C-alpha cells in the first residue's frame, strides 16, 4: 500500500510542478504572518505603557505601527491567495487526468477477471477513491507547509526576543502540541465515527429490507425486529462511550491551555518585576510560542490525509497497471483481407475461472463451412452460451487450438475479429440513448436509409410508427419503456446494421409470438447466403429449415448430420421430435420532549461556555493593566497572583462545563437516534408490500434514509438549541461589556463583526474539509459510467470502448471547467477574510490610540473591547460553523415523520373482521383481474377464474411471466384486486381476519432466503407466537431429508449461516425451505418451483412427505418439471393471464391443444 510515493504524482505535467513549488513558497510566507504580528503587537504594548505613564506623541507612534500592521496584512493576503488557489489547481488537474485514465483502464478487461469483482463495489470504488486522493493532494500538503512555517517562525521569534520564558514554554509545549493534534482529529472525524459504529446493525437492516416479501410471508417480522433492537443497543453504547471520550479530551485540552496562561503570566510577572523583561516582551514571547506550538496540531489531519491518499492510490494504480492476458485493442493483431466463413474447433477444453474446479467442457471438435446454418440442441447446462462466448474470444481455451479459415485466432487482431461477428445474446436490453443512436451503435457511419432498410428487415417499424418521436424516443433504463418483442426485434436490427460475416443468434425468439418470429426467420434466411450462421434456440420451428443440426451431451458434441440422419439414428433428437409431433413544520422537538431534563442541564452549561469568552477578556485586560498603572511592586505581585489564579479557575470550570455539555447533549442525540431508528424500522416492517413496489421507495433509499435521516434529526434539534445559546451568551455579554466600557470604539468594531464571523466560519470549513460541492454536483456524470458497465451487453455486442469512453470524457469536461473557477473564487474568499482580520487588528488599535490620547478611555478598555468583541465574533463564527445545516435536517425530519405516520392499507395488527371458528378448505376465483400498481398501463391478468376443492392437487402451467406467482400473491393478501370475486369456503377474504389467513397457510418461496442465524433455527423459521418444540424440528428435518446434512455438520443445530444461505449449497437451502414450510402444517399449501435446483433422488424424498401429507390439505404446485404435474389432480394452463384448458390430465391428453405441446417436450 504505502509504496511509490513519487508515483502518485506520476500524472503531472510541467505546469503542475510549477504550481506546486510556487504554492509551497506562498505557504511558508503565510506561515510567517502570525508570529511577526505578535512581535509588532508586543512592541505596541510597550509603547502604550510608557506613553500612558508619561502623551501627545502616542498618536504619532501608533500611526507608524498601524502602517506595519497594514503592511503584514497585505502580505498575508497575497501569499494566502497564491497558496490556496495554486495548490487546488495542481490537485484539480491531476485528479482529472487520473479519473479519465482510470475509467479507460476499467473499460478494457478480460471477462474472466470481470467475474471476480462485483460491479457495484467497483463502481463505488472509482468515485470514492478518487475523492479521497483529491482530498489529500489538494490542500493537505499546502496546509502542512503553512503550519510548519508558522511553528518555526514562532519559535525563532520567541528565542530572539527573550530566551528564558521561551525555554519554559518549550518545556510545557509537548503536552500543548499533543492536545492540539487530538482536538483537531476529533473535530475532523466526529462525523466519520458514527458510520463505523452503526455498521453491524446496518447489515441486518439491509438483509431484511432486501427480502421483505419473504419475511412477510413467514410472519417473522417480530423476531427480526428483536435482532435489530439488539444491534441498536450496541450502537448506542458505542456512540455514548465515544461522546464521553471526545468531550473529556476537549475539556482537558482547554484546562491545559488555561493552566499554560496561568504559568506563563506567573513567571512573566516574576521576570518583569525583577527588571529583566518588559510587559510587551512577555506578551511577544508567550504568544509567538503558544501559537507556534498549536500549529503542530493542525499538521496531523494533513499527514493522515496523505497516508489515506497513498493507500487508495495503490489499489487504483494496480487496476491501471494490471495487464490482462487478452486485450480489447491490439495494433499487432494481424487483420485478414479475404474473410471467408470457415470455423475450425479441435480438442477445445475450457473452464470458467470463476469456478475452475468444475469442468463443463471435455473437448469439442467442429468444422463449419460457409453458408452452413448449424443448430445445436441440448438441455440447459451443456453450454451453448459457453460456446457462443468462446467464439468471440471473450476467453481462451485451455487445450487445443481454434481457427477461422486456416489460421488460428491466437496470432490475429481481436478488434477486427470482433467487429465481423454479429452476435445477439440471450437477453437484449435497450439503451437509454435515442433509438436512432441505438441502431447506430453497430457501426460509425450509417445513414438513415440503411437504418430504415435494417429496421424493415427486422419488421420493427410498426411500433416505431405508432409511438411519438419516431427517431427521438428516449427509451428508459434496461428496456423498460417498451415491450420485450419490440426489444428483441430492434436488438436483431442492432446486430444486423454491422453487416457481419458470421452471425450468431442465442435464443433470439424467447418471448416472441408466431408471425414476428416467422418474418424474422425469413429475414434471417434473406441474409444467410453470403455469411456463416449459428443459431441457438428452444423453438424447433426455426431449426427444421437449417443446414446441420447437432447435439450437446456433457459438453461434448455427440450426434452429427442432417435431419434424416438423426431421424434414422434414433438418438435424443429423435426422442425430441417424436415427443413434439414537501411539508415541514416545527414538530421535530415534540417527539424528543420526554428527554427534556438532558436539555435543561445542557442549556445551562451551554450559557457558561459562551460566558467564558468575556470573563477571559476582563481578566486578560486587567492583568495587562497591572503593569500599565503606576503602583508599587507588592501591589503588582498580589494582583498578578490573583489574576493567574483566576486563569486556573476559569480553566477548571471550562473543563467541567465542556464535559457536561458534551455528555448531556450527546446522550440526547444518541437516545433520539435510537428511538427514531427503532420506530421507523417497526413502521417499515408493518408497511404493505406495494409500498415497497413504488420506484420512488427502493431497497436502497430506505436503508439510506434509516442511516442518515434518523441521525440528522438530533443535529436539527440539539445542535440548534446549544448553538443559539452559546452564541447569544458569548456575543450578548461581549457587546454589552464593550458598550459599557467604551462606545466609540465599540461602534467601529461592530461595523466589522460580520466579516470576522464569516472569516471564522471559512477557516472552520477549511479545517473540517467539508466535501467538495463540485463532485456532489458532478454525480450526474457518474450514471454514464454506471450504465455503460452495468449493461455488459452492447459492450460485448461491440467493444464500444470508444463511444462510451468518449461520452464519459465529454460529460466530465463540464465540471472540470467549473472546478477551476471554484479554486480561484475560494482562494480569494480565504485570503480576503484573513487579511481582514489583520487590518481589523490595525484599525482598532489605531482608533484606540487616538481615544487614549484625548483621555476618552484607558488602555485596559481598548484591550477589553478588542478581545471581547473581535474575538467574540470569531468564536461566534467557529461555533456556528460546527452546527449542521438547519434546512437539510429540517426537511429530513419531515421525511421521517412522513414515514412514521404513514398508514398501511392492509392492517397487520388489527383483529377486526370475520372470525369463523371452522372452515372446509375450498377456494373459488371468479373474474379476477389484477394490474400492478407500478405498471398501471400493462394488464397481466384478464379475468381469470378457478375452482379448488379439498385435496385437489392443482397444477398451474404456463410461460415464464404469465401470472404464475400472481395467483399466490392474490391469495396471501399481498395485492387486493380491483375487480373479481374470491370465495374461501363461501367466506370472502376481504371481510375476514387478516392475520388468520396468514397464520393458517404456508408456502415455499421462489428463491430460498435465510436469516443470519443457526440452521436449526433457520430451518425452523416459519412458526411464531408458539413454543417451538425441538422434536418437531428433528421430525421436520427427517421428513425433508435434511436431517443428514444437519447431523453431519459441526455445531449441528448451532451452525452459524451467513446472509441468504451463501455458505451451503442450493439444493440444501431449498430442502430446508421445505422443512421451514413443513413446520407450519398448513391446511392450504402452495409450492412455487419446488425443484428448481434439486437432485433427482432428492425430488422423490421431497415428494413422499408431500404425497403422504397432501391428504386433508388443499395442495397447489406450480413448476416447470412435468414429474409433479403428471400425478396432479387438475391442471390449469395459462396464456397471457387467461385460463385456456382445465380439467383432468387424461382429458387434456385426449384433446390435443397447447398442453400437448407443453407436456410432450423431452419425454419418450
Amino acid at each position, epitope marked *: 500500500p504505502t509504496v511509490s510515493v513519487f508515483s502518485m504524482f506520476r500524472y503531472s505535467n510541467w505546469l503542475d510542478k510549477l504550481y506546486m513549488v510556487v504554492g509551497t513558497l506562498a505557504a511558508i510566507i503565510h506561515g510567517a504572518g502570525l508570529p511577526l504580528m505578535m512581535l509588532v503587537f508586543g512592541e505596541m504594548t510597550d509603547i502604550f505603557a510608557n506613553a500612558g505613564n508619561l502623551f501627545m506623541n502616542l498618536e504619532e507612534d501608533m500611526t507608524r505601527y498601524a502602517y506595519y500592521y497594514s503592511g503584514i496584512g497585505a502580505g498575508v493576503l497575497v501569499a494566502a491567495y497564491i497558496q490556496v488557489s495554486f495548490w487546488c489547481l495542481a490537485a484539480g488537474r491531476q485528479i482529472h487526468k487520473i479519473r479519465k485514465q482510470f475509467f479507460h483502464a476499467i473499460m478494457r478487461q478480460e471477462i474472466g477477471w470481470f467475474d471476480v469483482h462485483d460491479v457495484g463495489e467497483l463502481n463505488t470504488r472509482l468515485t470514492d477513491d478518487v475523492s479521497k486522493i483529491n482530498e489529500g493532494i489538494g490542500d493537505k500538503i499546502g496546509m502542512f507547509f503553512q503550519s510548519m512555517a508558522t511553528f518555526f517562525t514562532g519559535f525563532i521569534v520567541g528565542f530572539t526576543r527573550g530566551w528564558k520564558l521561551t525555554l519554559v514554554i518549550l518545556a510545557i509545549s509537548p503536552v500543548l502540541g499533543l492536545s492540539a493534534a487530538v482536538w483537531a482529529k476529533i473535530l475532523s472525524s466526529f462525523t466519520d465515527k458514527e458510520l463505523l459504529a452503526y455498521a453491524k446493525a446496518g447489515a441486518v437492516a439491509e438483509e431484511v429490507l432486501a427480502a421483505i416479501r419473504t419475511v412477510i410471508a413467514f410472519g417473522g417480522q417480530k423476531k427480526e425486529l428483536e435482532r435489530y433492537n439488539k444491534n441498536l443497543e450496541e450502537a448506542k453504547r458505542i456512540g455514548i462511550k465515544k461522546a464521553i471520550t471526545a468531550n473529556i479530551s476537549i475539556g482537558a485540552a482547554f484546562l491545559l491551555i488555561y493552566a499554560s496562561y496561568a504559568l506563563a503570566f506567573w513567571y512573566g510577572t516574576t521576570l518583569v518585576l525583577s*527588571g529583566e523583561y518588559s510587559i510587551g516582551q512577555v506578551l511577544t514571547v508567550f504568544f509567538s510560542v503558544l501559537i507556534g506550538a498549536f500549529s503542530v496540531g493542525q499538521a496531523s489531519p494533513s499527514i493522515e490525509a496523505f497516508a489515506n491518499a497513498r493507500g487508495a492510490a495503490y489499489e487504483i494504480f494496480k487496476i491501471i497497471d494490471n495487464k490482462p492476458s487478452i486485450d480489447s485493442y491490439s495494433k499487432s493483431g494481424h487483420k485478414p483481407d479475404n474473410i471467408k466463413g470457415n470455423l475450425e474447433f479441435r480438442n477445445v477444453h475450457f473452464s470458467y475461472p470463476s469456478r475452475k474446479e468444475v469442468k463443463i467442457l471435455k473437448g469439442l471438435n467442429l468444422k463449419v463451412q460457409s453458408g452452413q446454418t448449424v443448430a445445436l440442441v441440448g438441455n440447459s447446462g451443456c453450454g451453448k452460451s459457453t460456446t457462443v462466448q468462446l467464439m468471440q474470444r471473450l476467453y481462451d481455451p485451455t487445450e487445443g487450438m481454434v481457427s477461422v479459415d486456416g489460421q488460428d485466432i491466437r496470432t490475429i487482431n481481436v478488434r477486427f475479429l470482433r467487429e465481423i461477428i454479429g452476435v445477439v445474446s440471450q437477453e437484449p436490453v435497450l439503451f437509454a440513448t435515442t433509438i436512432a443512436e441505438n441502431i447506430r451503435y453497430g457501426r460509425e457511419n450509417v445513414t438513415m436509409d440503411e437504418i430504415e432498410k435494417a429496421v424493415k428487415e427486422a419488421n420493427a417499424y410498426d411500433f416505431i410508427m405508432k409511438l411519438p418521436h419516431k427517431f427521438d424516443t428516449l427509451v428508459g433504463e434496461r428496456g423498460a419503456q417498451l415491450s420485450g418483442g419490440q426489444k428483441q426485434r430492434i436488438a436483431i436490427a442492432r446486430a444486423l446494421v454491422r453487416n457481419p460475416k458470421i452471425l450468431l443468434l442465442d435464443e433470439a425468439t424467447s418471448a416472441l409470438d408466431t408471425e414476428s418470429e416467422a418474418v424474422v426467420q425469413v429475414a434471417l434466411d434473406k441474409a444467410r447466403k453470403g455469411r456463416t450462421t449459428i443459431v441457438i434456440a428452444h423453438r424447433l420451428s426455426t431449426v427444421r429449415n437449417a443446414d446441420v443440426i447437432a447435439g450437446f451431451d456433457d459438453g461434448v458434441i455427440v450426434e452429427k448430420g442432417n435431419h434424416d440422419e438423426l431421424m434414422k439414428e434414433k438418438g435424443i433428437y429423435f426422442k425430441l421430435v417424436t415427443m413434439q409431433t414537501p411539508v415541514s413544520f416545527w414538530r421535530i422537538m415534540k417527539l424528543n420532549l420526554t428527554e427534556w431534563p438532558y436539555f435543561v442541564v445542557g442549556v445551562f452549561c451551554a450559557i457558561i461556555n459562551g460566558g467564558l469568552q468575556p470573563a477571559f477578556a476582563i481578566i486578560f485586560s486587567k492583568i495587562i493593566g497591572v503593569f500599565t498603572r503606576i503602583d508599587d511592586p507588592e501591589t503588582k505581585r498580589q494582583n498578578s497572583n490573583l489574576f493567574s489564579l483566576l486563569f486556573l479557575a476559569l480553566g477548571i470550570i471550562s473543563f467541567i462545563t465542556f464535559f457536561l455539555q458534551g455528555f448531556t447533549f450527546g446522550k440526547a442525540g444518541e437516545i433520539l437516534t435510537k428511538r427514531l431508528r427503532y420506530m421507523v424500522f417497526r413502521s417499515m416492517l408493518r408497511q404493505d408490500v406495494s409500498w415497497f413496489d413504488d420506484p420512488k421507495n427502493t431497497t436502497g433509499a430506505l436503508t439510506t434514509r434509516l442511516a442518515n435521516d434518523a441521525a440528522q434529526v438530533k443535529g436539527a434539534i440539539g445542535s440548534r438549541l446549544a448553538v443559539i445559546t452559546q452564541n447569544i451568551a458569548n456575543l450578548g455579554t461581549g457587546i454589552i461589556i464593550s458598550f459599557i466600557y467604551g462606545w466609540q470604539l465599540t461602534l467601529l468594531l461592530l461595523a466589522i463583526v460580520p466579516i470576522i464571523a464569516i472569516a471564522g466560519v471559512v477557516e472552520m470549513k477549511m479545517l473540517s474539509g467539508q466535501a467538495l460541492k463540485d463532485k456532489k454536483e458532478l454525480e450526474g456524470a457518474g450514471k454514464i459510467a454506471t450504465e455503460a458497465i452495468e449493461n455488459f451487453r452492447t459492450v460485448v455486442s461491440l467493444t464500444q470502448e470508444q463511444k462510451f469512453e468518449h461520452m464519459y470524457a465529454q460529460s466530465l469536461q463540464v465540471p472540470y471547467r467549473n472546478s477551476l473557477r471554484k479554486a480561484h473564487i475560494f482562494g480569494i474568499t480565504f485570503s480576503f477574510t484573513q487579511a481582514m482580520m489583520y487590518f481589523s487588528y490595525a484599525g482598532c488599535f489605531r482608533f484606540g490610540a487616538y481615544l487614549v490620547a484625548h483621555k476618552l478611555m484607558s488602555f485596559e478598555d481598548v484591550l477589553l473591547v478588542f478581545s471581547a468583541v473581535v474575538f467574540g465574533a470569531m468564536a461566534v463564527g467557529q461555533v456556528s460553523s460546527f452546527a449542521p445545516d438547519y434546512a437539510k435536517a429540517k426537511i429530513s425530519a419531515a421525511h421521517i415523520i412522513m414515514i412514521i405516520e404513514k398508514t398501511p392499507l392492509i392492517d397487520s395488527y388489527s383483529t377486526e373482521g370475520l372470525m369463523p371458528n371452522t372452515l372446509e378448505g375450498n377456494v373459488t376465483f371468479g373474474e379476477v383481474v389484477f394490474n400492478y400498481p407500478t405498471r398501471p398501463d400493462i394488464p397481466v391478468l384478464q379475468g381469470l377464474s378457478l375452482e379448488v376443492k379439498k385435496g385437489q392437487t392443482l397444477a398451474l402451467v404456463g410461460s415464464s411471466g404469465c401470472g404464475k406467482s400472481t395467483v399466490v400473491q392474490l391469495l396471501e393478501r399481498f395485492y387486493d384486486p380491483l375487480a373479481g370475486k374470491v370465495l374461501l369456503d363461501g367466506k370472502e377474504i376481504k371481510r375476514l381476519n387478516v392475520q388468520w389467513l396468514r397464520a393458517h397457510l404456508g408456502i415455499v418461496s421462489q428463491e430460498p432466503i435465510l436469516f443470519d442465524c443457526s440452521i436449526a433455527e433457520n430451518i425452523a423459521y416459519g412458526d411464531n407466537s408458539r413454543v417451538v418444540s425441538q422434536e418437531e424440528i428433528v421430525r421436520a428435518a427427517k421428513e425433508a431429508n435434511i436431517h443428514a446434512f444437519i447431523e453431519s455438520l459441526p455445531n449441528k443445530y448451532s451452525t452459524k449461516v451467513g446472509d441468504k444461505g451463501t455458505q451451503l449449497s442450493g439444493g440444501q437451502k431449498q430442502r430446508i425451505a421445505i422443512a421451514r414450510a413443513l413446520v407450519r402444517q398448513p391446511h392450504i399449501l402452495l409450492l412455487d418451483e419446488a425443484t428448481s435446483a434439486l437432485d433427482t433422488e432428492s425430488e422423490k424424498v421431497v415428494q413422499e412427505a408431500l404425497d403422504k401429507a397432501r391428504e386433508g390439505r388443499t395442495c397447489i404446485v406450480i413448476a416447470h418439471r412435468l414429474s409433479t404435474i403428471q400425478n396432479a389432480d387438475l391442471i390449469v394452463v395459462f396464456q397471457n393471464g387467461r385460463v385456456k384448458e382445465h380439467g383432468t390430465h387424461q382429458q387434456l391428453l385426449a384433446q390435443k391443444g397447447i398442453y400437448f405441446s407443453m407436456v410432450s417436450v423431452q419425454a419418450g
Partner: antibody, heavy 119, light 113 residues
C-alpha cells in the same frame, strides 16, 4: 504640575474620629498609588498608609491598623483618610503623597494638615 | 521591623566643600525581586520633604548632579559636594524592601561660618 491640597483635621478629643481629604489635580489621579505620611512634633517621620490605584489593596503599620481607613474617590480625584479612636499620641502633621514611576515611593508631597488630639 | 540609623546627626560643613551622610540598615535590606529600594529625602526648614534619589544610584529628575549616592547591601551613603546654602535642611532615609516601611532618624546640616 501636581497640586495636592489637604483639608480637614484640626482639634479632636481622644477616641475621636476625623476625616482628612486631599484634593489632587494635574496628573490623572486615577492611575497613581497614593500614600499618607505623618510627622510628629518630635520631628521624626513615620508611615501611615498606602492605597493602590483605584483598587482595594490597603496597607498599614501595626499601630494604625484597625483604627485607620483609607479610600479614594476617583470621580473627583480625592483621597480620604478616616481616623477613629485617636490616641493622645497621634498629634501630628499629615502629608499626602504620590508615587513616582521607576519605583520611588513618595515623589510629590502635598501641604501638611495639622491634627491635634488632646483633652 | 527594620531599624535605620544615620551615624552623623549634626553634620556642620564649610560653604563650598563636600559633606557626606551615612545610613546603616539592619537585615541587609533586599527586596525579593532583587532591588534594594532605599531612597533619600531632603526637608528644608518650613517646607515639605522632597525626593533626592529614588534608588541608591539613580537620582530623581530635577536634582543637581552634585548629590551622589552609593550603597552596598546593608550600608548606604550620600555624598553632597560643593555645599551651597540652598542645600540646608534635614536628610531622611526610607526603605521599602520590608513589609513595614520606616524612615530613619533625621540628620541636620549646618553651613559653617
Amino acid at each position: 504640575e501636581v497640586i495636592l491640597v489637604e483639608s480637614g483635621g484640626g482639634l479632636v478629643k481622644p477616641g475621636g474620629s476625623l476625616k482628612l481629604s486631599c484634593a489632587a489635580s494635574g496628573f490623572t489621579f486615577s492611575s497613581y498609588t497614593m500614600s499618607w505620611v505623618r510627622q510628629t512634633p518630635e520631628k521624626r517621620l513615620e508611615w501611615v498608609a498606602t492605597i493602590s490605584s483605584g483598587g482595594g489593596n490597603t496597607y498599614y503599620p501595626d499601630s494604625v491598623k484597625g483604627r485607620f481607613t483609607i479610600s479614594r474617590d476617583n470621580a473627583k480625584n480625592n483621597l480620604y483618610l478616616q481616623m477613629s479612636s485617636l490616641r493622645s499620641e497621634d498629634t501630628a502633621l499629615y502629608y499626602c503623597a504620590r508615587y513616582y514611576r521607576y519605583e520611588a515611593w513618595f515623589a510629590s508631597w502635598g501641604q501638611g494638615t495639622l491634627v491635634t488630639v488632646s483633652a | 521591623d527594620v531599624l535605620m540609623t544615620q551615624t552623623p546627626v549634626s553634620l556642620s560643613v564649610s560653604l563650598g566643600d563636600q559633606a557626606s551622610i551615612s545610613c546603616r540598615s539592619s537585615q541587609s535590606i533586599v527586596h525579593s525581586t532583587g532591588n534594594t529600594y532605599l531612597e533619600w529625602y531632603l526637608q528644608k526648614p518650613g517646607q515639605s520633604p522632597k525626593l533626592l534619589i529614588y534608588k541608591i544610584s539613580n537620582r530623581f529628575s530635577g536634582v543637581p548632579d552634585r548629590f551622589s549616592g552609593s550603597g552596598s547591601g546593608t550600608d548606604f551613603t550620600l555624598k553632597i559636594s560643593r555645599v551651597e546654602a540652598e542645600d540646608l535642611g534635614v536628610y531622611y532615609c526610607f526603605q521599602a524592601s520590608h513589609a513595614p516601611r520606616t524612615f530613619g532618624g533625621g540628620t541636620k546640616l549646618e553651613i559653617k561660618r
